[PDB]
Structures are given as C-alpha cells and as structure tokens.
Amino acid sequence: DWDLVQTLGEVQLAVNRVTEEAVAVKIVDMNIKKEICINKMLNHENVVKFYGHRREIQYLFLEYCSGGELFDRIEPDIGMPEPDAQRFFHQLMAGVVYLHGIGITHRDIKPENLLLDERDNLKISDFGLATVFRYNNRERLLNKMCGTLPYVAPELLKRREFHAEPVDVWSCGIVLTAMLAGELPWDQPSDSCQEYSDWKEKKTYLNPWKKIDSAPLALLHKILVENPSARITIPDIKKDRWYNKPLK
Ligand SMILES: NC[C@H]1CN(c2ncnc3[nH]cc(-c4cccc(CO)c4)c23)CCO1
C-alpha cells in the first residue's frame, strides 16, 4: 500500500505505508506499451530504475531521485564548478554507454531528463521517446525527428536517415556546454542560426565558448562536429584529455 505524498512534476512521490520506501509513480491517461518494454530492459546505476506497472489508468513505478533534475544545478549564465560538471559528464557517459550497449537510444538527452539521487548520482530519465536502434547485432537507421531543438544534432534537420548513436553524443555535448557556461549555444543547429554559423567558423571568442576552459572546449570541438560520421565517438571521448584530467 502506497500513499501519494506530493506531485513531483504527471509524476507523484509515493511512500510505502509499511517500509516508508519512496518511489516515483508516473500516471498516464489512455505509445505506453513501448516505454514499459524498454524500461523493463534497463538495469544500471546511472539509469532510472523501473520497478513495475499496474493497469486500470496506467501506472509506472520508478526510482525516486530526491536530488531533482540537473537543470536546477545549473546557474544561468554561469554553469557550475568544472569538477562538478566533469563528474556529472562521467556519469552521463556511463549511462549512455550502457544504453547504446543494449541497443537503446534515449533520443531526448537534456538536463531536464537527467536526475540526481541523494548522493548527487546522475540518472538518465524518461524513455517515452527512446527506441531500439540495434537488434540481433543489426543496426537500424533512424528517420523520425525526436528530441528538443537546442539539443538535437544537425543531421536530424538535414538528412532523411541517420545513425542513432552520434545523435545522443551530440546532445550530451550540449548538456556539457550548458553545465560549463549556464547557457545553450543555439535555438537549433541550422545554418539559419547565427550562433551555429559562428561556432562552425570557430568564433570561440564569443559566448558561450568564451566562458569555457580550453581543455573542456577542445572536447566540445570534437563532439559538436556537424558531420555525424566525423563526430567523436564515446570510446574516444573516454580517451579525451579533459575527460581524464584530475579535478577538485
Ligand atoms: N520537473 C520535475 C520532474 C521530477 N521528476 C522526478 N523527480 C524525482 N524523482 C523521479 N523519479 C522519476 C522521475 C521522472 C519520471 C518520469 C519523467 C521524468 C522527467 O524526466 C522524471 C522523477 C518527475 C517529473 O518531473
């Protein structure tokens, strides 16, 4: 038996009447079948845990993350301490490597979908837009536009089909930019976007790039690459100098 204590954002905080264990419950009014199936596949310390579901309407039982969303740890126009950003980025990569390893792409990575537990461990949240991109070791290209414009990779806007993995890598790059600068670089990654044009012309003397140290900036130079085929992959991110730099 669970008491619904408060609304978290609909999602409510449920507390067990006997054990007082707290979980989050997602309530949807009547595709949900897919989200549940994907959630049932998921088991990793940087992915929100799925506990089960009950039907009537539909209820999803999810790991409660008391630290809230990463979004709220980001100070507008400033960001956060670089060591905090690195630690969160490490954990983000951990989660994303896990997902890609089981053939799942999140497709909407952004700070609103990155939660923190009581120890400030990052948890990737919400698989409502996620999909399978590898099955029986065979990759399938994506073609549906999904995600959130400031975070989407340029190939989603220009190409009919594209690989799932570089898209998630890109959005993680924008998250990192936000964590380090406290702002998003562009409304969308298109040529009609002056700030995107400037980035492509390497005007890093402009904001948000001017606020970012050269070492993390060098990593961003390899992530925010327009050609998804030339974009740095995760295995190579893990070899990056800043990624491996000891920090406070
Ligand atoms: N805007 C606040 C946000 C909070 N979010 C959660 N907060 C605390 N623990 C949680 N566990 C699971 C969720 C959650 C469930 C479904 C979607 C999302 C959004 O990324 C989070 C959660 C609940 C939603 O609102």
**Can you list the domains of the chain with their CATH numbers?**
1-75 (3.30.200.20), 76-248 (1.10.510.10)
Q: How far apart are the first and last CA of the chain?
A: 44
Q: Report which DSSP code applies to 178.
A: H
Is 108 an annotated catalytic residue?
A: yes
**Resolution, expressed in angstroms to one decimal:** 2.0
β-bridge mates for residue 60, sequence order: 26, 53
* Residue that is written with structure tokens 């999909």 in the block: 131
**Which residue numbers belong to the known binding site?**
8-11, 26
Structure-solving method: X-ray
Residues 182/157, Cβ–Cβ less than 8 Å: no
In angstroms, the CA 14 to CA 247 distance is: 37
Q: Count CA within 13 A, CB hemisphere, residue 214.
A: 0
Angle between helices 82-101 and 164-181 (to 10 degrees): 170
Strand ranges (E), 10-169: 11-16, 22-28, 50-54, 58-63, 68-69, 104-105, 114-116, 122-124, 131-132, 134-135, 138-139
Going from the Cα of 142 to the center of ligand 1, the distance in angstroms, rounded, reads 26
Q: Phi/psi of residue 232, each to 5°?
A: -60, 140
Going from the Cα of 106 to the center of ligand 1, the distance in angstroms, rounded, reads 15
Strand ranges (E), 68-121: 68-69, 104-105, 114-116
SS3 call for 58: strand
SS3 call for 94: helix
Pairing of strands 2-7, 50-54: unpaired
